[PDB]
Amino acid sequence: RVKKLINSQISLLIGKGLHEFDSLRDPEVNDFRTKMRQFCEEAAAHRQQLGWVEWLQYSFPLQLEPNRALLVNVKFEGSEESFTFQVSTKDMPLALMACALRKVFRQPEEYALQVNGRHEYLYGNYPLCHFQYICSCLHSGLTPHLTMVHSSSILAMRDEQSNWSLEQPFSLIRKVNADMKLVVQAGLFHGNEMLCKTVSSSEVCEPFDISVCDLPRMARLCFALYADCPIAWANLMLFDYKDQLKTGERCLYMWPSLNPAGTVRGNPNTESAAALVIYLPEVPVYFPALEKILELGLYEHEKDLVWKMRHEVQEHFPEALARLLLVTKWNKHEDVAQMLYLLCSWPELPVLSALELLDFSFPDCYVGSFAIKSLRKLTDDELFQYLLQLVQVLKYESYLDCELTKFLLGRALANRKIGHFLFWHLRSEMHVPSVALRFGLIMEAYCRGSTHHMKVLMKQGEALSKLKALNDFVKVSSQKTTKPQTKEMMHMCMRQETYMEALSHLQSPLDPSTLLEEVCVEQCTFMDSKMKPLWIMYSSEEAGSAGNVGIIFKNGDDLRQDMLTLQMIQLMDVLWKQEGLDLRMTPYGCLPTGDRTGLIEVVLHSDTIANIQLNAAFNKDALLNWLKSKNPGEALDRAIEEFTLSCAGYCVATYVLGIGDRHSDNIMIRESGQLFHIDFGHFLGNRVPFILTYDFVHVIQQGKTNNSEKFERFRGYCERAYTILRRHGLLFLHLFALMRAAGLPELSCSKDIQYLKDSLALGKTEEEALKHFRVKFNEALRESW
Numbered sequence: 079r080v081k082k083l084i085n086s087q088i089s090l091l092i093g094k095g096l097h098e099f100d101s102l103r104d105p106e107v108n109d110f111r112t113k114m115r116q117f118c119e120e121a122a123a124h125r126q127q128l129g130w131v132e133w134l135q136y137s138f139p140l141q142l143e144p145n146r147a148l149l150v151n152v153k154f155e156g157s158e159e160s161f162t163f164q165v166s167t168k169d170m171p172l173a174l175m176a177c178a179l180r181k182v183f184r185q186p187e188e189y190a191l192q193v194n195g196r197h198e199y200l201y202g203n204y205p206l207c208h209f210q211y212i213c214s215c216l217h218s219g220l221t222p223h224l225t226m227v228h229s230s231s232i233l234a235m236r237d238e239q240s241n242w243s244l245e246q247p248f249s250l251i252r253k254v255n256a257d258m259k260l261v262v263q264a265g266l267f268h269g270n271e272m273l274c275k276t277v278s279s280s281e282v283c284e285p286f287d288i289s290v291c292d293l294p295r296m297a298r299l300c301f302a303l304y305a306d307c308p309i310a311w312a313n314l315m316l317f318d319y320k321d322q323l324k325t326g327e328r329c330l331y332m333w334p335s336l337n338p339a340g341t342v343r344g345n346p347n348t349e350s351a352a353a354l355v356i357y358l359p360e361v362p363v364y365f366p367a368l369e370k371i372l373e374l375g376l377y378e379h380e381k382d383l384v385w386k387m388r389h390e391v392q393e394h395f396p397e398a399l400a401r402l403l404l405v406t407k408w409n410k411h412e413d414v415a416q417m418l419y420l421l422c423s424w425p426e427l428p429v430l431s432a433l434e435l436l437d438f439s440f441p442d443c444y445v446g447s448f449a450i451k452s453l454r455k456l457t458d459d460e461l462f463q464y465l466l467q468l469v470q471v472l473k474y475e476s477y478l479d480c481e482l483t484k485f486l487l488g489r490a491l492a493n494r495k496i497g498h499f500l501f502w503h504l505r506s507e508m509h510v511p512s513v514a515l516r517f518g519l520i521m522e523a524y525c526r527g528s529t530h531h532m533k534v535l536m537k538q539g540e541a542l543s544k545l546k547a548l549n550d551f552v553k554v555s556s557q558k559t560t561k562p563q564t565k566e567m568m569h570m571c572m573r574q575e576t577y578m579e580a581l582s583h584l585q586s587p588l589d590p591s592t593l594l595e596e597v598c599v600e601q602c603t604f605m606d607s608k609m610k611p612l613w614i615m616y617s618s619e620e621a622g623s624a625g626n627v628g629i630i631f632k633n634g635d636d637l638r639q640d641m642l643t644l645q646m647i648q649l650m651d652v653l654w655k656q657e658g659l660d661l662r663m664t665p666y667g668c669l670p671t672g673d674r675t676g677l678i679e680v681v682l683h684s685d686t687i688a689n690i691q692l693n694a695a696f697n698k699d700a701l702l703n704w705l706k707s708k709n710p711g712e713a714l715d716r717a718i719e720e721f722t723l724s725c726a727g728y729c730v731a732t733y734v735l736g737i738g739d740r741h742s743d744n745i746m747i748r749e750s751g752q753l754f755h756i757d758f759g760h761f762l763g764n765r766v767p768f769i770l771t772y773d774f775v776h777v778i779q780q781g782k783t784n785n786s787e788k789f790e791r792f793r794g795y796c797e798r799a800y801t802i803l804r805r806h807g808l809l810f811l812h813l814f815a816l817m818r819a820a821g822l823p824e825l826s827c828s829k830d831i832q833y834l835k836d837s838l839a840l841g842k843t844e845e846e847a848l849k850h851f852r853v854k855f856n857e858a859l860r861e862s863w
């Protein structure tokens with residue numbers, strides 16, 4: 079009786095009824111559901127038994143940065159009284175907890191410090207400066223506000239959150255766009271490479287050189303209906319999920335336009351799609367087992383020598399695995415068995431090398447499982463960093479039950495932050511028919527393993543439902559009345575009991591540690607841009623100035639490129655900080671949540687260069703005079719430096735990623751001096767050269783006409799930042815390679831990925847690449863008036 083309600087909620091949450099899965103009567107979809115539910119309920123079981131410090135690690139993972147005086151305000155749970163302490167930046171949380179315990183009435187290890195009005199906590203053997211909240215409070219100049227939450231209070235949160243040897247050569251039987259003759263071109267693929275010659279049909283509008291023993295485990299039959307005028311395409315795995323070779327006829331529901339990367343599952347639109355009927359022949363015959371395979375196991379000459387020293391490749395150079403995998407003959411079963419035998423004794427590879435193995439160039443199930451075993455060593459911070467890519471790779475998968483789905487679902491049920499973003503990446507693509515079944519099932523399994531978080535996500539989904547309804551009203555009204563009239567009409571709609579409830583008391587889909595408490599309707603409005611986005615302000619009494627946070631709701635545009643660009647800039651910032659370089663970056667949150675729908679984090683105390691220049695004796699002084707008002711006296715020098723660093727950081731970021739169409743309207747400055755970029759519509763030269771605006775150069779130069787001292791410090795930052803990224807060049811190339819799965823119009827072919835190779839100058843020597851950058855930087859200076 080209670081299971082009916084839970085299933086009803088899952089259906090509403092995932093944006094797909096659970097009845098649709100059962101109606102398919104597909105054994106693959108049924109076996110995934112039954113197996114994955116047990117795996118998820120086991121995770122929920124192990125979670126309700128975890129200790130209070132272990133639960134805190136699940137629900138509120140620590141936000142850490144990749145001696146000095148500090149005034150901290152410590153509070154207690156269920157008390158209005160607060161006390162200010164003189165603690166060091168080197169001091170641990172346990173020492174600060176001892177001070178609060180010492181502080182007036184009549185063990186510190188039984189407590190955890192909560193960040194006021196936020197789902198963030200301060201615990202563990204880490205100095206105060208290492209935590210992202212205390213670190214940010216130092217730079218902002220704001221006093222950190224903490225709460226002494228006892229073990230009994232944390233434990234009560236866990237309790238409230240309760241739950242085959244045949245040499246026979248391999249070998250067509252509606253709703254087609256008429257004109258011309260229709261021909262079916264077919265090929266046998268194993269990832270990118272072809273197993274044999276692409277045999278096509280006979281050339282009027284409703285109408286292989288490989289042995290069966292040689293066909294690999296992960297082989298695909300790729301069809302295409304031509305007229306040259308393309309009509310449709312269709313893919314199929316020759317072996318099923320149960321490991322047996324496909325026998326008999328099959329009706330293939332074609333996708334509208336050989337495409338190897340495309341899905342192996344059929345078109346859901348059975349009514350309005352072209353169907354191709356194929357005759358797959360009688361041989362039961364299942365693929366040989368691991369025991370049977372192990373019992374059997376660059377230029378043309380360069381690849382021949384790599385295959386000869388295959389045994390030496392395992393011992394001498396184990397990181398060369400990928401080069402050997404692209405040289406192995408997948409069209410010859412004897413060669414596959416010898417390679418697979420080497421893969422079983424192959425030692426575990428580092429995270430960087432495993433990220434490469436997850437590409438479409440390595441479609442083998444065993445080679446795939448090797449990459450997951452090597453990716454198990456990823457930290458929850460590293461896994462979150464590459465989460466977008468690992469979700470896109472699920473589109474390359476052949477079967478519903480895969481090692482990547484197990485790993486992502488296993489880590490998501492072990493970390494609430496990881497499970498939060500895995501939910502949104504899956505939910506935001508339920509409009510796309512090719513992934514809607516897979517993504518739907520993965521989200522259902524997660525819900526079976528997290529009934530409390532399911533209701534937490536339901537509240538987020540309800541807020542976003544009211545936001546679309548309010549935005550459509552804004553869209554219609556903006557084309558009919560004056561802005562103040564529309565804004566008041568929006569406020570009235572928001573002030574409704576249905577809206578006030580849904581829009582208040584929730585977790586930010588952008589940051590689960592950010593609590594969207596009370597909605598500040600009076601301060602809410604909409605942006606003048608084409609899609610009329612919504613400016614939604616919030617406030618929390620318990621958090622004070624920390625709860626004064628905002629969100630931007632935008633419907634009508636694809637937010638995937640922006641999310642990807644910002645994440646890359648955030649990876650740039652992390653790698654820079656790792657080499658001691660803090661370029662004061664502002665990687666604001668950007669998370670798509672639906673069909674051309676998403677959320678963008680509000681950077682408070684910021685304005686656009688355009689609004690600052692439009693209002694000083696000279697226009698060149700505007701940007702600087704603004705920083706003089708927002709930073710008077712001694713504070714200006716710190717702000718010119720914050721500007722200088724962020725300008726250097728954003729100059730390299732836009733150059734390396736090839737972001738163009740940068741103007742005064744899509745560049746912002748924070749009152750701290752921190753410059754940042756918004757609206758990343760175009761990237762990877764869709765060649766964008768280095769850019770130096772004289773308006774920013776005037777600020778770097780402290781107002782002076784010829785300040786070589788300050789300007790050249792800035793050249794140094796750009797150079798340092800560029801050389802740091804160059805070292806991790808492969809990280810960006812490997813991540814962008816996996817992102818080809820997403821189907822982003824500016825990231826589809828090899829030419830887009832080649833842009834990153836040219837911008838980072840991967841081939842050239844560090845000395846030679848620094849000079850090439852020095853020529854482009856100087857050309858950017860000459861370009862400034």
Ligand SMILES: COc1ncc(-c2ccc3ncnc(-c4cccc(C(=O)N5CCN(C(C)=O)CC5)c4)c3c2)cc1C#N
Nearest residue numbers: 605606611613630632640666678679680681684686756757
């Ligand atoms: C995916 O595209 C995007 N990318 C980045 C941003 C983005 C992100 C953070 C931001 N943080 C702070 N300000 C902005 C920003 C930039 C330009 C104009 C305005 C604006 O319309 N205002 C009227 C309301 N208002 C007040 C006080 O009433 C504030 C000014 C706001 C921000 C814009 C947005 C989008 C979109 N759509």
